């Protein structure tokens, strides 16, 4: 229907893309807590991003609020997210693998991500929701 | 034992500073025009306001009769009599410096467990203050 | 004026004052002759080399040149009598400690200073207009005829 279009890296050199349709597309008090967003005051947009969060990969889509983190920390999580015990498959009882780890009681995160719906993380989670306290209790 | 220094001071000002329990008070003697006192007081246990008159006394020992880590401190017992009974605020500290301000003015620095006191006066009124431990007694 | 030197004289003086409870008001019993001769002969006991020939003796004298300058400046006649109020007993105590402390600071024969020096220079390197950091350190260690950014400073 001509509503979406595949664009490669080479073709991006000759188009103008909008971050989101909420503000950049419409012709153009402010909350003090919201991040400072630049309108860019452009009236020649040719494409609009589906969602800026989609620039991330599979491993980086599990981090909650990755834009509130220092960039190197996100990289570490991506590598560590691949070493976390979980449920790799539902047929672990019929597969004879060299090594396999299964969590007793996997739980889905309390703070999730929209992209996390399409990774089946709510169906095959790797981790648990633990009550965490940040304190210097005993020096251990 | 015996009083080494006694006088009545009028609190010129009180400064809480960055602390919430300790205030540094500037006071001057009402009888001597060359005597001043800088003292840190725990206002949580002994509140002090401006224009207040304080009786300041310094003694080498608290026992009434003269007896000129010495001994292990023990909790006071019933029927114990000492100079502290006649005053409201009592502190114990050490003198760590004797500074000459002018020909006849001498300043003695006292530290009561981190609460510093500076006693400035003429040579003929602070001659009994030695570089040793002493008690500071304050009565409203 | 701030440079690394073996013996911390300031701490030794403070210890003598606090150990003997110097009066600071009563006049001292030290004599000008004792102080000048006490400091002078102390400099003779600061032995790093113990050869009994001219060449080694000259080397020994040169080795303690800077330390003696510090020693003389701190233990000056006016400073000792006026600033420190030292007593004869206190002065003798200070001299003995300085001799003992200096002899304890001498390098011990058999110490592998070469490995220690290399590790002391290499360990900081791991944590590292002109070239700086590892590329410059590599440029220095490897004697390269052509460096990245040669420069001249002209006064």
């Amino acid at each position: 229907e001509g509503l979406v279009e595949y664009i490669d890296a080479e073709e991006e050199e000759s188009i103008l893309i909008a971050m989101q349709p909420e503000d950049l597309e419409p012709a153009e008090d402010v909350d003090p807590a919201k991040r400072i967003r630049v309108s860019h005051h452009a009236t020649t947009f040719t494409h609009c991003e589906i969602h800026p969060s989609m620039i991330l990969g599979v491993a980086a889509s599990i981090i909650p609020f990755p834009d509130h983190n220092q960039s190197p920390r996100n990289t570490y999580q991506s590598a560590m997210g691949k070493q976390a015990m979980g449920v790799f498959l539902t047929n672990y009882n019929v597969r004879m693998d060299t090594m396999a780890n299964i969590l007793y009681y996997p739980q889905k995160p309390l703070g999730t991500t929209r992209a996390m719906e399409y990774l089946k993380f709510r169906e095959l989670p790797a981790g648990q929701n633990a009550i965490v306290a940040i304190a210097c209790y005993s020096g251990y | 034992s015996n009083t080494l220094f006694d006088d009545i001071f009028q609190v010129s000002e009180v400064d809480p500073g960055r602390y919430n329990k300790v205030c540094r008070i500037e006071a001057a003697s009402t009888t001597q025009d060359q005597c001043k006192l800088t003292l840190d007081i725990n206002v949580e246990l002994f509140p002090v306001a401006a224009q207040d008159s304080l009786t300041v006394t310094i003694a080498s020992s608290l026992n009434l009769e003269d007896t000129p880590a010495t001994r292990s401190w023990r909790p006071p017992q019933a029927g114990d009599r000492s100079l502290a009974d006649d005053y409201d605020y009592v502190m114990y500290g050490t003198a760590y410096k004797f500074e000459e301000v002018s020909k006849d003015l001498i300043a003695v620095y006292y530290s009561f467990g981190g609460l510093l006191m500076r006693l400035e006066g003429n040579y003929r009124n602070l001659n009994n203050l030695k570089q040793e431990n002493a008690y500071l007694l304050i009565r409203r | 004026a701030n440079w690394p030197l073996p013996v911390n004289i300031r701490r030794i003086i403070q210890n003598a004052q606090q150990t003997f409870h110097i009066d600071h008001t009563k006049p001292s019993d030290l004599t000008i002759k004792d102080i000048v001769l006490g400091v002078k002969d102390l400099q003779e006991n600061l032995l790093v080399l113990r050869g009994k020939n001219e060449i080694i003796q000259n080397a020994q004298r040169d080795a303690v040149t800077l330390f003696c300058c510090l020693l003389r400046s701190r233990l000056a006649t006016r400073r000792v009598l006026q600033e420190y109020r030292l007593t004869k007993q206190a002065f003798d105590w200070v001299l003995s400690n300085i001799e003992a402390q200096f002899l304890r600071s001498v390098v011990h024969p058999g110490e592998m200073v070469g490995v220690l020096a290399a590790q002391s220079i290499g360990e900081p390197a791991t944590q590292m207009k002109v070239t700086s950091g590892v590329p410059r350190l590599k440029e220095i260690l490897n004697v390269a005829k052509n460096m990245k950014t040669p420069s001249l400073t002209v006064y």
Partner: protein, 559 residues
């Protein structure tokens, strides 16, 4: 290199390391299973004939126990399979290979082991669980954390090596490093933050808590100090209790900026006869700094006394912080409304300044700075304005922080963080730089496919106006990610290149030694220096001192 210079060795153990604030500086916690595997051959003498016999009876499956018995003829008897004939009768000169016990000196190491303080000798302390345990204060010399790091342990097998290890490689002997003639071990993390909080003038401790804190110091003299406040309630100041851990006779004086005898900000330091007179205790005093408390103690009272100081301070400080508490949360990174308004205006002013210069360059009315191109001069001006904008914005946020703010508390004590961390978390991340320059035009005359060509505004070339609290916009997120990738690449490349440099340096100077004539010579006997260091002193005993004669005016010198 693979079989002669370095080779695999027996009588060693490896496992994960953990932190134990209840262990002495030189003590190391050894898992029970490891202790049951490693053995030390002890010779049978009249002094231990009875003790060793019990170990043989205990067998190899009960710690403390024994695994082998070696006769004077060299024959080895395995304890297993030997009980059927009964316990063996020991004779003088035999060797009993018994499990490593408490206080046994062992060599504890962590690779890459780039310097001599990364390999030190500890005293064994057999413990439950499957992890090594070591004091926190000795983590900095090892450059080790407890995120999963492993360390190697070696057990000497002879009395000569046993004595050599404990008299040269002992942890207390390594407190004062010779690399920079300053201590390499100091109070860190919880104990550094707790000691700063404990020494504040507002910290008063009641009788019930004081008695517990006093008793926690092993070398306590059994005398309760007189409270700072006698009436109307007996209260002990935090400085008074901490002074108990400091050995008597230690004097230390330091003056910071604005510090006087009557310290108004309670800064500086003054200790007389082991009692803290005034001043807060922070990294400048109890840390691994030149002229600090550790340096003074280890040089005046010896290394063994200094080692006890580490435990005493940690034990008293950790106990107080356990019952006091210390945390940090999102509320510590939030600045009040007025500060945020000032921060937003400050960044806007910098942007307007950048706007003005970007307009003069477009008009060609800007003269290039000498020695630089017009474009290079313009970039330097833009970078300088933006860099100063972040610094000014961070200053406003830091000033607004209260004394109760936990992040501020950590920064002041020196335990963790710094000014930049506060600014980026609360005020502004700032300009992202790649290759020491702003974000380059990866595309044709633009950075991302969202700005028009020839856009030089801060938002276009990688200026993150938001903070981590507010969140990064997608453009800022990518530019920030680009900057971080530079750091990760450098870390990998730097590690490899620096490792080769260190090996080359060590091999070039490995044969240089100080001889009994005080000359520095190599294996050939060639003289490198006629006296070590040109003065003949040891770097571990050097201290920074002021020369009073060089400085000052002539009149001052005469006076």
């Amino acid at each position: 290199r693979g079989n002669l210079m370095g080779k695999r060795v027996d009588f060693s153990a490896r496992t994960v390391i953990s932190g134990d604030p209840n262990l002495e500086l030189d003590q190391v916690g050894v898992p029970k299973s490891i202790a049951k595997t490693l053995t030390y051959p002890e010779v049978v003498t009249p002094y231990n004939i009875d003790r060793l016999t019990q170990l043989v009876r205990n067998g190899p499956n009960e710690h403390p126990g024994a695994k082998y018995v070696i006769r004077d003829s060299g024959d080895r008897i395995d304890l297993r399979y030997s009980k059927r004939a009964g316990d063996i009768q020991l004779q003088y000169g035999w060797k009993v290979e018994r499990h490593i016990m408490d206080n046994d000196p062992v060599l504890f190491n962590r690779q890459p082991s780039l310097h001599k303080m990364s390999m030190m000798a500890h005293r064994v302390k057999v413990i439950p669980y499957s992890t090594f345990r070591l004091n926190l204060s000795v983590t900095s010399p090892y450059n080790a954390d407890f995120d999963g790091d492993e360390m190697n342990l070696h057990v000497p097998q002879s009395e000569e090596t046993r004595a050599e290890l404990s008299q040269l490689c002992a942890v207390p002997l390594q407190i004062v490093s010779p690399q920079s003639n300053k201590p390499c071990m100091g109070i860190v993390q919880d104990t550094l933050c707790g000691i700063r909080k404990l020494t504040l003038r507002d910290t008063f401790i009641e009788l019930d808590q004081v008695l517990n804190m006093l008793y926690w110091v092993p070398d306590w003299d059994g005398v309760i100090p007189t409270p700072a406040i006698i009436k109307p309630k007996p209260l002990w100041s935090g400085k008074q209790i901490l002074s108990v851990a400091i050995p008597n006779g230690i004097h230390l004086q330091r003056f910071d900026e604005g510090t006087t005898l009557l310290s108004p900000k309670d800064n500086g330091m003054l200790i007389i006869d082991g009692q803290i007179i005034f001043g807060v205790v922070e990294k400048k005093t109890v840390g691994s700094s030149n002229g600090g408390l550790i340096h003074v103690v280890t040089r005046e009272k010896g290394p063994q006394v200094c080692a006890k100081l580490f435990g005493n301070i940690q034990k008293v400080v950790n106990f107080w912080l356990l019952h006091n508490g210390f945390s940090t949360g999102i509320g510590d990174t939030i600045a009040d409304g007025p500060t945020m308004r000032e921060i937003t205006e400050t960044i806007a002013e910098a942007k307007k300044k950048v706007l003005d210069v970007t307009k003069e360059a477009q008009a060609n009315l800007l003269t290039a700075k000498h020695g630089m191109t017009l474009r290079e001069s313009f970039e330097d001006n833009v970078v300088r304005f933006l860099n100063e904008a972040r610094d000014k914005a961070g200053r406003l946020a830091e000033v607004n922080l209260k004394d109760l703010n936990n992040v501020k508390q950590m920064v002041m004590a020196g335990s963790k963080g710094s000014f930049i961390n506060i600014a980026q978390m609360s005020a502004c991340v700032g300009q992202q730089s790649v290759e020491g320059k702003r974000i380059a035009f990866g595309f044709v005359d633009r950075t991302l496919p969202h700005f028009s060509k020839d856009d030089y505004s801060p938002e276009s070339k990688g200026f993150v106006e938001n903070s981590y609290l507010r969140g990064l916009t997608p453009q800022e997120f990518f530019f920030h990610a680009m900057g971080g990738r530079e750091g990760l690449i450098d870390t990998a490349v730097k590690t490899a290149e620096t490792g080769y440099i260190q090996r080359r340096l060590v091999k070039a100077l490995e044969d240089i030694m100080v001889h009994y004539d005080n000359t520095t010579r190599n294996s050939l006997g060639n003289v490198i220096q006629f006296i070590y260091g040109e003065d003949g002193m040891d770097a571990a005993h050097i201290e920074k001192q002021s020369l009073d004669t060089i400085g000052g005016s002539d009149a001052a010198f005469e006076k």
